[PDB]
Amino acid sequence: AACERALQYKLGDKIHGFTVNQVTSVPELFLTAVKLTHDDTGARYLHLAREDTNNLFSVQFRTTPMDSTGVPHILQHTVLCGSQKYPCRDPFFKMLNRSLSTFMNAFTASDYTLYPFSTQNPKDFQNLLSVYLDATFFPCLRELDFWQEGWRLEHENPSDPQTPLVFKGVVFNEMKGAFTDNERIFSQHLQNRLLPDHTYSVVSGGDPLCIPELTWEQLKQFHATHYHPSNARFFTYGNFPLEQHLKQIHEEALSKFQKIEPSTVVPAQTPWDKPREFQITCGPDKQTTVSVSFLLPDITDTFEAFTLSLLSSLLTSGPNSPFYKALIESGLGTDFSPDVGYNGYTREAYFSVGLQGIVEKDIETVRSLIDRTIDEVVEKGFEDDRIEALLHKIEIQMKHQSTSFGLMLTSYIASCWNHDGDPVELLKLGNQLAKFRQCLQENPKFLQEKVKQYFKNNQHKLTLSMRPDDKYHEKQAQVEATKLKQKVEALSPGDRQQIYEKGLELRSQQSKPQDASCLPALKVSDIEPTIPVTELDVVLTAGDIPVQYCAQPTNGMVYFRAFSSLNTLPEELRPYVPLFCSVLTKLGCGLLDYREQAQQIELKTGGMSASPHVLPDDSHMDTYEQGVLFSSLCLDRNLPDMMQLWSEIFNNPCFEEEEHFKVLVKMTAQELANGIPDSGHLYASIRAGRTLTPAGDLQETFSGMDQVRLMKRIAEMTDIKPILRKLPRIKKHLLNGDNMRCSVNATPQQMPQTEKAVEDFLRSIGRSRPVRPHTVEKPVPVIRKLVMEPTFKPWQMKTHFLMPFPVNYVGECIRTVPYTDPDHASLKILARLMTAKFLHTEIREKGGAYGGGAKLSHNGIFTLYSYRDPNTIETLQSFGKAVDWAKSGKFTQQDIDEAKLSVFSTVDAPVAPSDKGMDHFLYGLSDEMKQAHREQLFAVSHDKLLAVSDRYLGTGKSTHGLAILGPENPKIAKDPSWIIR
Ligand SMILES: [Zn+2]
């Protein structure tokens, strides 16, 4: 075992230029931590040895911008554009298709940049390690790679210098879209105002109005100052041998450097003498946000950070928390303000609390309630059972097995490590918990004293309020048009000529097919021919309810799911099903009111939820399954309590709870509205697909813009009673055992108790004709009752949702073929091929959009999309040209092999013990069906790819749907084939 092998390392051991400084067992996480330092550079290393085949590498640099140009963000994009050992264009994106990685990305936080990848293949790991090391330490930083990724002046037609110069660039648009999210605007300003003295006062990602101030030389300087191994932290996780990692890191990078003292220290924020307050504005959607925030200690004091994080949870988490009762239940707002709770990304942490959706006349009342709540907590402290619930919640987080543990761990330790803290102390949760408990036993006023010290008597307090401006982005555009004009007018004739020539040069480099034989690569033969079979046992229970049991190493956790059909539900009630689902476990049950119920759920489970699903059939486009998925998890010992809760929720849910219902509705509506820009492409594609299949229509109703708008309507109702009365009607057709199947994932030793607890639940719920005339029994590989609409006819629609956004989100959906159709595998390969070889270049590289690609869903919907796109019309035109390119067959066998690697990267991604058997449980596909599909994927050839392109994607071949979220577009507005919404 990897963790055992690492215990053999001794202090003082020398390995490939590193010295072992510490070896620590962390048995609660089944791992051994090895701390090392590189001898010559002083670079810090942490290896977490654990029996996990999904290994991760990351390198972290302390990056401290002193302006809002976004230099560390733009640098992060640019280092991935070519390096000394791999000078070809775009090593990172190319490696995405030459690898079987489980994760490959890069992130820029406020004061660090982090470069992680993960994979379960050891050769692949070495390959990706060499590319990442070369990119971060020896990057090309070519002027034109920057122009592409950062910002540039470019003629609207690069080969026509009489066309106007405009701003373009990937990060430029990425950040425009990031600050389309009004919570992100608030969150950025909060940090900037609370920590105004140093690096934390600026916009590290890039303020769009500041980006064009960035120069190429500034970009290179920032790299020279921050990207030295003395300024870095190296991290590996998993069961691959440490020695090979150290050998690569030393020989390919660190051996070329000597020790420096980096000029990258982030100094302490000097505490204020008196609180401050500020007001800002932000875009339209009466709706004022206000928060109060407090500066907290240095996160490098790990136990104090741990204590304050838990304290922040006690203060703000759930309907029983003091701030929830005082602020959310007050009905003064819709939801908590952004970044509520503990914020520990910055050298000094901070706590924040407040509300959004408040009428401006209520700001002072909110501020007063915040102060009154603090005084009350100081005086009365916290309920002991809530503290037990929190410690229980942490136990669940400790025991639950995830597939991305390495990524979670490096992200969790990053900020503390950034400021020379000790990441190993962060891993010792058992110690931290025990010390926290001992601190409660020894001082009964421990938490009260902490609240008094950090909240009541703390002068470093910020009140920030934000109010919408209906012309927010318009004013930004006007300022941008202004700055553009100033730059352009300043151009000498030589400058204009340089811009023209370099623009043409960049376009050429973006167009010319290039040799990539530089990069390492796996081969298709490195893909496993078959997959391990999933073992499950289906037992008919409580008569004829099928229950699926899947024994897994869940580490003492039980995962329960029940699926209940929607086939008997009157169709008029369908749009209210998502609302029903969101409040079902939150309104109280039986003798438990909503507060008692929340406490029991927090104390006894890791969560209990219901959600509506539409599950497409594997063989027929116009057949689907519809129902509600009930999902929960708990520790072994709490299983009977969990099922008792499910029994009460199914039998006696509190549908008379009108007050709390209104709170939940307004929270849900607020959250759905806030999340639109971040998921803009998803909303576009859901709309575009809604007229293509019966399932698609239902999905729009459940989770599309229609559902967002319905929730917003409901949240504005003066009398919510007519809605509330629909809930019992829904309960009647759903909360029973008439059309149900369940699943259980647990350890084989926990299985026997679980079968009994599950049987009792099923016997405890109600028992004893589909509203659709055509229902069909589809046996598995459990009879599922599906809806088929044999007279469904797809039709084309084009919808433009007018949004006050500075960028666009575009979706085009095309009806193709279901999973078991042999052409499905070809279309799946084609989606990645088109993304990698056409769409990424046209839409992102040339266009400047943050994202552009194609994908194929299980339902057979082929979707082309863009994300944070400055274009609309040109993007739709590129979709058409992508199809023309596919039909031309102008791609190589190597391009196809790379598309396969990419697809299999996704398809063969690790599945958590809790999620095993879910493919079978939900979609009813057996291992035999998946393996057949896998073989079809392996057999996809060049001739098949051009055939399916012509057969399904060509004009007039299949039905298409289109949707756009974005601002006014004159051309679309004048086209009567477009619906404006
Ligand atoms: Zn970025």
Swiss-Prot record:
Cofactor note text: Binds 1 zinc ion per subunit.
Annotated disorder: Spinocerebellar ataxia, autosomal recessive, 30: A form of spinocerebellar ataxia, a clinically and genetically heterogeneous group of cerebellar disorders due to degeneration of the cerebellum with variable involvement of the brainstem and spinal cord. SCAR30 is a progressive disease characterized by childhood-onset global developmental delay with variably impaired intellectual development, motor dysfunction, and cerebellar ataxia. Affected individuals may also have psychiatric abnormalities.
Originating species: Homo sapiens
Task of the protein: Metalloendopeptidase of the mitochondrial matrix that functions in peptide cleavage and degradation rather than in protein processing. Has an ATP-independent activity. Specifically cleaves peptides in the range of 5 to 65 residues. Shows a preference for cleavage after small polar residues and before basic residues, but without any positional preference. Degrades the transit peptides of mitochondrial proteins after their cleavage. Also degrades other unstructured peptides.
Localization (cell): Mitochondrion; Mitochondrion matrix
Phylogenetic classification of the source organism: Eukaryota, Metazoa, Chordata, Craniata, Vertebrata
Subunit description: Monomer and homodimer; homodimerization is induced by binding of the substrate.
Gene assigned in the entry: PITRM1
Residues given in the record as Zn(2+) binding sites: 73, 77, 174
Protein name: Presequence protease, mitochondrial
Cysteine disulfide partners in this protein: 88-518
